[PDB]
PDB file of C-alpha atoms in Angstrom:
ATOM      1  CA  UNK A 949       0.000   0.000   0.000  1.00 29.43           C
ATOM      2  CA  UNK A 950       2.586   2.584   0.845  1.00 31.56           C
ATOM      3  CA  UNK A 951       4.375   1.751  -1.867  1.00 31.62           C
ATOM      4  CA  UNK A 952       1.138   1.807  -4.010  1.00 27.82           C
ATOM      5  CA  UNK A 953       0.227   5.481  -1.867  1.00 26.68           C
ATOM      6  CA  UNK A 954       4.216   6.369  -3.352  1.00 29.53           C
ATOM      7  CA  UNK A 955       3.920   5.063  -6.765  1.00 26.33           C
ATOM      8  CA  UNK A 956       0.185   6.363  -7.654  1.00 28.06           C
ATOM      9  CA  UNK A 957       1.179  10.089  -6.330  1.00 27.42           C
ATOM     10  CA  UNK A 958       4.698  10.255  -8.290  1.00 26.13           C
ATOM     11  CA  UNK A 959       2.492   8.907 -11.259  1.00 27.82           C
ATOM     12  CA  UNK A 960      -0.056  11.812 -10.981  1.00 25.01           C
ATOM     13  CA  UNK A 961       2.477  14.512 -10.198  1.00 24.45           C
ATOM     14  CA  UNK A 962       4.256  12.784 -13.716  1.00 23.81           C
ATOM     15  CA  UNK A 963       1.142  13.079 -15.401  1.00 21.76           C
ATOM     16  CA  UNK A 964      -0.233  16.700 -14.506  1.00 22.51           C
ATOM     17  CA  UNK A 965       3.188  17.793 -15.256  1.00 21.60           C
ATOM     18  CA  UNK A 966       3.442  16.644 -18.885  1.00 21.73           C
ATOM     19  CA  UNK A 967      -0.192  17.279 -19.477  1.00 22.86           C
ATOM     20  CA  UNK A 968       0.681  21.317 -18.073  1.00 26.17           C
ATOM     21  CA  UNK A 969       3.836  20.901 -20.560  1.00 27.52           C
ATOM     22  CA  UNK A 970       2.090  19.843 -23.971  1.00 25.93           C
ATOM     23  CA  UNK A 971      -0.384  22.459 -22.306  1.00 26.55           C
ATOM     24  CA  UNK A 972       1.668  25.347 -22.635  1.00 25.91           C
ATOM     25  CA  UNK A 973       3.406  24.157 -25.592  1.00 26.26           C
ATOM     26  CA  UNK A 974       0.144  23.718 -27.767  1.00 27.06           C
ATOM     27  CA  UNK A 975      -0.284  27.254 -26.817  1.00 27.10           C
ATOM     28  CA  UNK A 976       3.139  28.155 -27.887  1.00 27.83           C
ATOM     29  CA  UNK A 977       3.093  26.187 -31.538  1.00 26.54           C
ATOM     30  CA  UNK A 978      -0.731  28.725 -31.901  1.00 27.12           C
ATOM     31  CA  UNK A 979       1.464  31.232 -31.020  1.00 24.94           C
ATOM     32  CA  UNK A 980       4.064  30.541 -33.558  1.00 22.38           C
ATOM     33  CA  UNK A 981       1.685  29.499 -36.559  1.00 22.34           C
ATOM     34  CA  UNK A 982       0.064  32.874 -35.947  1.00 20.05           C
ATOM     35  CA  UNK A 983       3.371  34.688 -36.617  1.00 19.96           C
ATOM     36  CA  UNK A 984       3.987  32.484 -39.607  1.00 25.06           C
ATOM     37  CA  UNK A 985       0.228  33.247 -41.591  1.00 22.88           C
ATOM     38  CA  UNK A 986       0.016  37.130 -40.564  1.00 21.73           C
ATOM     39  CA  UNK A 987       3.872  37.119 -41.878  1.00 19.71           C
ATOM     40  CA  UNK A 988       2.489  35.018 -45.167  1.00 21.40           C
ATOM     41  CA  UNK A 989      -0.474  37.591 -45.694  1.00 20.99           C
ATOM     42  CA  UNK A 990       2.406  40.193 -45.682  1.00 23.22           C
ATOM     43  CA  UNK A 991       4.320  38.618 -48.163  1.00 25.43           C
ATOM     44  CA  UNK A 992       0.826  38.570 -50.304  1.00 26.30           C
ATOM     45  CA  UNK A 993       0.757  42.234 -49.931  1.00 26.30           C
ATOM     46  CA  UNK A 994       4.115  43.034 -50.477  1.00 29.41           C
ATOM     47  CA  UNK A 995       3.908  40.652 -53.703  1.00 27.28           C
ATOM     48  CA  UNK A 996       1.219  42.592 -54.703  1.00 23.46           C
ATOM     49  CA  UNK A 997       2.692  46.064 -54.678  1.00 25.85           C
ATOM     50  CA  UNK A 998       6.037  45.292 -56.103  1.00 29.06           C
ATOM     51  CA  UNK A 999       3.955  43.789 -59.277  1.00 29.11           C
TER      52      UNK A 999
ATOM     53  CA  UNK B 506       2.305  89.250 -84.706  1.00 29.29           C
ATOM     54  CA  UNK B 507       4.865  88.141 -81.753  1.00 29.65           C
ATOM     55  CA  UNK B 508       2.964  89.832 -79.029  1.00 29.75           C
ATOM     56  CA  UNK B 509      -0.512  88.713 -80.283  1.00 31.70           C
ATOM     57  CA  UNK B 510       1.204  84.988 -80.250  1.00 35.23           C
ATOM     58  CA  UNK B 511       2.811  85.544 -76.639  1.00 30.57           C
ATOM     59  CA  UNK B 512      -0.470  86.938 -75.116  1.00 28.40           C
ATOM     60  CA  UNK B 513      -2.170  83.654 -75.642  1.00 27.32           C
ATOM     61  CA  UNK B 514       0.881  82.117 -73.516  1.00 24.66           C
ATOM     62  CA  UNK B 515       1.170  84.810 -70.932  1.00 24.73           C
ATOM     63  CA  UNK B 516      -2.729  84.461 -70.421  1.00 22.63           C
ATOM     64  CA  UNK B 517      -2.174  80.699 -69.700  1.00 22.59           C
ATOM     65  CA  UNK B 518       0.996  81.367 -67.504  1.00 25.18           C
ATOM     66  CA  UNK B 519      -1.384  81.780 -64.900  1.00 24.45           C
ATOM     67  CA  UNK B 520      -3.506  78.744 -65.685  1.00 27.27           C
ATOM     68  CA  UNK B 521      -0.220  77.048 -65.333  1.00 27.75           C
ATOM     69  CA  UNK B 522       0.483  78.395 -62.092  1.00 28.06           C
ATOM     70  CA  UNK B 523      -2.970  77.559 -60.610  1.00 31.76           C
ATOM     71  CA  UNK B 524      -2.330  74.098 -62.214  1.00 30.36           C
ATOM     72  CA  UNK B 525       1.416  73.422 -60.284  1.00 30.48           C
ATOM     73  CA  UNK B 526       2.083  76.223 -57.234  1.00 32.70           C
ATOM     74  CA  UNK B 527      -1.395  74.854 -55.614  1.00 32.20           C
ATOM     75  CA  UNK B 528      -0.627  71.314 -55.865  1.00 29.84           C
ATOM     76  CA  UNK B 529       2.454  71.959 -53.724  1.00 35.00           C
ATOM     77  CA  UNK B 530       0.207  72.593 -50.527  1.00 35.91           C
ATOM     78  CA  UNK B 531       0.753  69.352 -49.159  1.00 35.82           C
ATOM     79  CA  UNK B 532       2.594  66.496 -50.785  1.00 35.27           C
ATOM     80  CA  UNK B 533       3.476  64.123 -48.046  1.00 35.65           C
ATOM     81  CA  UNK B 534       0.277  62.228 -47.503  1.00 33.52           C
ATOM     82  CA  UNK B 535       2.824  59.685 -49.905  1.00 32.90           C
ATOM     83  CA  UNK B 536       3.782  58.895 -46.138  1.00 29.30           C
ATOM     84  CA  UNK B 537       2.552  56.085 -44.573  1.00 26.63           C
ATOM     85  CA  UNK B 538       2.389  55.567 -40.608  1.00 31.59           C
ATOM     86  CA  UNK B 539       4.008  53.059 -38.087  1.00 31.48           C
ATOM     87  CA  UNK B 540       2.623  49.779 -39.298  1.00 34.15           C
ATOM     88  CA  UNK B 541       4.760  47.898 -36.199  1.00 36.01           C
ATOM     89  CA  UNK B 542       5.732  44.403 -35.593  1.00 33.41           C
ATOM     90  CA  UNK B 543       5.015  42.721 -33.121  1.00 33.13           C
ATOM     91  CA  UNK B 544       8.141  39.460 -33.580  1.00 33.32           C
ATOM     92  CA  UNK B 545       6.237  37.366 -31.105  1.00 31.24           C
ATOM     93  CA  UNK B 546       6.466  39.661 -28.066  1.00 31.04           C
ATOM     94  CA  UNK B 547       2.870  41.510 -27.738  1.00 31.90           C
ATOM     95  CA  UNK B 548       1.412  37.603 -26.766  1.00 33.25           C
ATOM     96  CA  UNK B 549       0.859  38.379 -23.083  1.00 31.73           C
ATOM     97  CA  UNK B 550      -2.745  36.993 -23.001  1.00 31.68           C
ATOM     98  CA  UNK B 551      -4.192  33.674 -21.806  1.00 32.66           C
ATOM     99  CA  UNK B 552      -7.793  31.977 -22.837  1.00 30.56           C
ATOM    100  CA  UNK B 553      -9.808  33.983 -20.489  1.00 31.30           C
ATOM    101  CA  UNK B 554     -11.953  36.726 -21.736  1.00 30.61           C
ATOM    102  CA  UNK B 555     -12.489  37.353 -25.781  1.00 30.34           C
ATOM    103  CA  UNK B 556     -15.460  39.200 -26.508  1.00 30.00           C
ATOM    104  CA  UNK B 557     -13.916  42.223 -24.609  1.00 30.77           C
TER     105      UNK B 557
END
């Protein structure tokens, strides 16, 4: 049991910790594909006037 | 004959200058304004309000 106590609450501490992780980093790779589009509809532009 | 002939071009000298000295009010609306970047640095925000 105290070894089952041990092992389940490293487990969840593991677990809440990589689900905060992938989390933050979804949030991060939104962040990132946002810079790359608004950066591509620039280009368009840009394309546009030099034309 | 020569002044009758330089009349007519006198008279639009001034048409001429309406034409150009006016247009020279104001050229630099050719300007454009800031138009900044932000380079992934104005993302300060979390998933908690959007409609305001």
């Amino acid at each position: 049991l105290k070894d089952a106590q041990e092992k389940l609450e490293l487990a969840e501490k593991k677990a809440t910790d990589a689900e905060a992780d992938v989390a933050s980093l979804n949030r991060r790779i939104q962040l990132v594909e946002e810079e790359l589009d608004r950066a591509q509809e620039r280009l368009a532009t840009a394309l546009q006037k030099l034309e | 004959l020569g002044t009758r002939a330089k009349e007519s071009l006198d008279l639009r000298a001034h048409l001429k200058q309406v034409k150009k000295e006016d247009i020279e009010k104001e050229n630099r609306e050719v300007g454009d304004w800031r138009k900044n970047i932000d380079a992934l640095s104005g993302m300060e925000g979390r998933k908690k309000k959007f409609e305001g």
